[PDB]
């Protein structure tokens, strides 16, 4: 009924202070992707709106850059960035697909 699947760039461990690329990809469906969100359980980081492009949430402006593609680049990692990240695809007519990335910002 809902055939598509999400690949991700995989679960991440990274040193404090670097920048890193998170990305998902929807495959094996032809639904139109109307909106992609990046979230953190309680927090919205960015919206790529179908025909309008990317908006970064004002509470993440200088921490997150849009791209590449439908992905994000987190900019100067802090231990607080550790957590689960979600790419959420709003599609017609399949619906909502979600993929999950866990990020662990270490202090080696």
């Amino acid at each position, epitope marked *: 009924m809902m055939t598509g699947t999400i690949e991700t760039t995989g679960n991440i461990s990274a040193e404090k202070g670097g920048s890193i690329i998170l990305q998902c990809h929807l495959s094996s469906t032809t639904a139109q992707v109307t909106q992609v969100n990046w979230e953190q359980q*309680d927090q*919205l980081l960015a919206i790529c*709106n179908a025909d*309008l*492009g990317w*908006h970064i*949430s*004002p509470s993440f402006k200088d921490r997150v850059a849009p791209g590449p593609g439908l992905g994000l680049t987190l900019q100067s990692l802090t231990v607080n960035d550790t957590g689960e990240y979600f790419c959420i695809y709003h599609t017609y007519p399949d619906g909502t697909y979600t993929g999950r990335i866990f990020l662990e910002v270490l202090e080696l």
Partner: antibody
Amino acid sequence: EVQLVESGGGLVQPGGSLRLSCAASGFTFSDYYMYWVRQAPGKGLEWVAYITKGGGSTYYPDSVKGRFTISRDNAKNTLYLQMNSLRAEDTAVYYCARQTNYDFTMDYWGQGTLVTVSS
Amino acid sequence: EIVMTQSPATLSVSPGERATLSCKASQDVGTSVAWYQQKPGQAPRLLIYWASARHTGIPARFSGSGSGTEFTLTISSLQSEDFAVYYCQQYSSYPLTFGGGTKVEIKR
């Protein structure tokens, strides 16, 4: 149909405290980020507070930080604004507003409560 | 804080004509600008988001444009009901800031 009904405004004295409420109906309140916005008599619009879906993060401008506290009860579908140390320049119609789920701005507003601070 | 300047604060336009409201930004706000219409005794309603996108239920004679620091709202085929104060707002960064407002008086 989406509705934001506000209550709790009134007259309260300098230094006093008041709690405004905003009852949401017609959408999944727990899905939505919320704000409060105020407007002094004959003046423009002033952002006042912001709360996340859950309640774990809040933001305020300096003008009000420390004295106002935004909170929410997703069980009751109700948003609250807790006001302390009310000064004169806090007289205003206070609006609640839900954030667009397609962008980061203010989709729909309540009718507002008047809050008069005076001796 | 990013200061949103709406000038003129007042415009007098004849019915059927085209009003052009201006909104400048003290710094680049990208396209994270919205436009609200506030009629007397009424809550603001959202007209434009994302600098140029029209909220649903909003007549097509309302149109927004601009990026960076200079933004514009245009009310075509102006009519009596359009009498209101119009505010621009930036949501690029905190604290969120509204413009001063431009009252559109209909010059009958």
